[PDB]
């Protein structure tokens, strides 16, 4: 579990969004596993606007932050789960690292701010949903 809090927006994994997130929906994309809802209180996270390929992510199943190298956001096949059928997820970045069910939502950060959140895992790989292209998160 986990979310990004920037301005009056809350960014969560779409498959973990609550019924209340849907009532307060701003934008969602099933193909990216992302959902953004509106908030009343202003948040303090800064979104990275860069092409960094190295950063640090939080792994809740280890209670540890790990430094990683990660691939550029791309269209990657994700096996069927209880949340989605087998499909290509877009804007996904992979790193060699640990992730297990329950780790989604952990933040991936570089020197510029938040890059994305954990969205996939298994087989010694961890996948992050990129948020750096969502320029509108920085306004209104
Ligand atoms: C590490 C982790 O999150 N997982 C994992 C790991 C090891 C074995 C199985 C899993 C399931 C789960 C995972 O990858 N997803 C289930 C939730 C939705 C995700 C998506 N973006 O489509 C896919
Ligand atoms: Zn960066």
Tab-separated table of C-alpha atoms and ligand atoms in Angstrom:
chain	number	residue	atom	x	y	z
A	1	UNK	CA	0.000	0.000	0.000
A	2	UNK	CA	0.963	3.668	-0.467
A	3	UNK	CA	0.182	6.924	-2.298
A	4	UNK	CA	1.771	10.169	-3.627
A	5	UNK	CA	0.358	13.468	-2.209
A	6	UNK	CA	1.071	16.430	-4.533
A	7	UNK	CA	-0.944	19.697	-4.343
A	8	UNK	CA	-4.617	18.708	-4.023
A	9	UNK	CA	-4.092	15.300	-5.734
A	10	UNK	CA	-3.685	11.733	-4.326
A	11	UNK	CA	-2.000	9.250	-6.744
A	12	UNK	CA	-2.656	5.580	-6.028
A	13	UNK	CA	-2.434	2.212	-7.800
A	14	UNK	CA	-5.819	1.965	-9.644
A	15	UNK	CA	-6.349	-1.612	-8.395
A	16	UNK	CA	-6.073	-0.380	-4.752
A	17	UNK	CA	-8.338	2.739	-5.205
A	18	UNK	CA	-11.266	2.945	-2.716
A	19	UNK	CA	-14.957	3.631	-3.619
A	20	UNK	CA	-14.274	7.165	-2.175
A	21	UNK	CA	-11.343	7.641	-4.604
A	22	UNK	CA	-13.788	6.972	-7.519
A	23	UNK	CA	-16.280	9.574	-6.175
A	24	UNK	CA	-13.379	12.090	-6.074
A	25	UNK	CA	-11.852	10.991	-9.419
A	26	UNK	CA	-9.729	13.441	-11.481
A	27	UNK	CA	-8.103	10.914	-13.913
A	28	UNK	CA	-7.538	7.164	-14.236
A	29	UNK	CA	-5.897	4.833	-16.762
A	30	UNK	CA	-6.356	1.046	-16.352
A	31	UNK	CA	-3.540	0.401	-18.865
A	32	UNK	CA	-1.121	2.315	-16.496
A	33	UNK	CA	-2.606	0.955	-13.143
A	34	UNK	CA	-2.928	4.627	-11.996
A	35	UNK	CA	-5.781	6.636	-10.408
A	36	UNK	CA	-5.676	10.256	-9.227
A	37	UNK	CA	-8.327	11.597	-6.818
A	38	UNK	CA	-8.860	15.145	-5.415
A	39	UNK	CA	-7.954	15.953	-1.760
A	40	UNK	CA	-9.033	18.744	0.667
A	41	UNK	CA	-5.633	19.236	2.331
A	42	UNK	CA	-2.560	20.239	0.302
A	43	UNK	CA	0.191	17.543	-0.040
A	44	UNK	CA	3.972	17.974	0.216
A	45	UNK	CA	5.476	15.578	-2.378
A	46	UNK	CA	7.313	16.998	-5.409
A	47	UNK	CA	7.093	15.086	-8.732
A	48	UNK	CA	10.424	14.593	-10.619
A	49	UNK	CA	10.628	16.156	-14.131
A	50	UNK	CA	13.682	14.370	-15.553
A	51	UNK	CA	14.959	11.231	-17.409
A	52	UNK	CA	16.842	9.729	-14.377
A	53	UNK	CA	17.368	5.950	-14.621
A	54	UNK	CA	18.752	5.515	-11.008
A	55	UNK	CA	16.884	6.129	-7.764
A	56	UNK	CA	15.790	4.620	-4.429
A	57	UNK	CA	12.501	2.739	-3.771
A	58	UNK	CA	10.670	1.662	-0.628
A	59	UNK	CA	10.028	-2.094	-0.183
A	60	UNK	CA	7.386	-2.649	2.582
A	61	UNK	CA	8.023	-6.448	2.673
A	62	UNK	CA	11.629	-5.793	3.760
A	63	UNK	CA	11.020	-2.449	5.698
A	64	UNK	CA	13.945	-1.178	3.593
A	65	UNK	CA	14.755	1.445	0.953
A	66	UNK	CA	16.908	0.098	-1.941
A	67	UNK	CA	19.055	1.936	-4.503
A	68	UNK	CA	18.181	0.712	-8.045
A	69	UNK	CA	18.826	1.207	-11.781
A	70	UNK	CA	15.515	1.102	-13.701
A	71	UNK	CA	14.476	0.926	-17.401
A	72	UNK	CA	12.725	3.722	-19.390
A	73	UNK	CA	8.875	3.804	-19.198
A	74	UNK	CA	7.568	1.314	-21.774
A	75	UNK	CA	4.777	-1.182	-22.720
A	76	UNK	CA	5.444	-4.442	-20.796
A	77	UNK	CA	3.418	-7.672	-20.557
A	78	UNK	CA	1.985	-8.285	-17.087
A	79	UNK	CA	0.588	-11.727	-16.173
A	80	UNK	CA	-3.065	-12.187	-15.159
A	81	UNK	CA	-3.904	-11.485	-11.483
A	82	UNK	CA	-7.106	-11.073	-9.363
A	83	UNK	CA	-7.077	-7.343	-10.502
A	84	UNK	CA	-6.437	-7.462	-14.243
A	85	UNK	CA	-6.450	-10.075	-17.021
A	86	UNK	CA	-3.102	-10.742	-18.835
A	87	UNK	CA	-2.304	-7.475	-20.731
A	88	UNK	CA	0.417	-4.937	-21.652
A	89	UNK	CA	0.778	-2.229	-18.995
A	90	UNK	CA	2.106	1.101	-20.396
A	91	UNK	CA	4.543	3.596	-18.781
A	92	UNK	CA	6.088	0.753	-16.701
A	93	UNK	CA	9.787	0.689	-15.601
A	94	UNK	CA	11.557	-2.422	-14.302
A	95	UNK	CA	14.436	-2.841	-11.857
A	96	UNK	CA	16.203	-5.910	-10.449
A	97	UNK	CA	14.930	-6.015	-6.860
A	98	UNK	CA	12.443	-7.494	-4.419
A	99	UNK	CA	8.683	-6.962	-4.588
A	100	UNK	CA	5.847	-9.224	-3.363
A	101	UNK	CA	2.019	-8.862	-3.154
A	102	UNK	CA	1.461	-6.016	-0.663
A	103	UNK	CA	4.421	-3.869	-1.920
A	104	UNK	CA	2.400	-1.762	-4.451
A	105	UNK	CA	2.362	1.939	-3.650
A	106	UNK	CA	5.970	2.183	-2.393
A	107	UNK	CA	7.621	5.362	-3.768
A	108	UNK	CA	10.545	5.372	-6.254
A	109	UNK	CA	12.513	8.674	-5.881
A	110	UNK	CA	15.545	10.319	-7.558
A	111	UNK	CA	17.372	13.655	-6.768
A	112	UNK	CA	14.457	15.548	-8.488
A	113	UNK	CA	11.555	14.057	-6.483
A	114	UNK	CA	9.001	11.266	-6.957
A	115	UNK	CA	9.441	9.218	-10.137
A	116	UNK	CA	6.703	6.610	-9.632
A	117	UNK	CA	5.176	3.918	-7.408
A	118	UNK	CA	5.599	0.112	-7.231
A	119	UNK	CA	2.998	-1.563	-9.474
A	120	UNK	CA	4.348	-5.074	-10.339
A	121	UNK	CA	6.827	-7.697	-9.083
A	122	UNK	CA	7.940	-11.313	-8.884
A	123	UNK	CA	10.810	-13.315	-10.436
A	124	UNK	CA	13.360	-10.980	-8.746
A	125	UNK	CA	12.036	-7.922	-10.642
A	126	UNK	CA	10.091	-4.865	-9.406
A	127	UNK	CA	8.029	-2.669	-11.729
A	128	UNK	CA	7.151	1.002	-11.166
A	129	UNK	CA	4.319	3.005	-12.694
A	130	UNK	CA	5.947	6.252	-13.962
A	131	UNK	CA	4.287	9.596	-13.050
A	132	UNK	CA	6.927	12.061	-14.526
A	133	UNK	CA	4.905	12.643	-17.707
A	134	UNK	CA	1.798	13.812	-15.683
A	135	UNK	CA	2.764	17.502	-15.901
A	136	UNK	CA	-0.734	18.628	-14.861
A	137	UNK	CA	-0.088	17.259	-11.305
A	138	UNK	CA	1.997	20.480	-10.751
A	139	UNK	CA	-0.973	22.830	-11.444
A	140	UNK	CA	-4.544	23.726	-10.220
B	1	LIG	C1	5.026	-7.849	-6.312
B	1	LIG	C2	3.616	-7.738	-6.752
B	1	LIG	O1	3.019	-6.656	-6.727
B	1	LIG	N1	3.024	-8.862	-7.265
B	1	LIG	C3	3.521	-10.193	-7.331
B	1	LIG	C4	4.788	-10.689	-7.055
B	1	LIG	C5	5.015	-12.052	-7.189
B	1	LIG	C6	4.005	-12.900	-7.596
B	1	LIG	C7	2.745	-12.405	-7.868
B	1	LIG	C8	2.497	-11.044	-7.739
B	1	LIG	C9	1.218	-10.278	-7.937
B	1	LIG	C10	1.654	-8.807	-7.800
B	1	LIG	C11	1.601	-8.083	-9.150
B	1	LIG	O2	2.614	-7.928	-9.813
B	1	LIG	N2	0.394	-7.671	-9.587
B	1	LIG	C12	-0.872	-7.819	-8.852
B	1	LIG	C13	-1.506	-6.462	-8.607
B	1	LIG	C14	-1.672	-5.699	-9.922
B	1	LIG	C15	-0.341	-5.612	-10.689
B	1	LIG	C16	-0.527	-4.933	-12.035
B	1	LIG	N3	0.006	-3.726	-12.145
B	1	LIG	O3	-1.132	-5.498	-12.955
B	1	LIG	C17	0.247	-7.012	-10.889
B	2	LIG	ZN1	15.499	12.677	-11.615
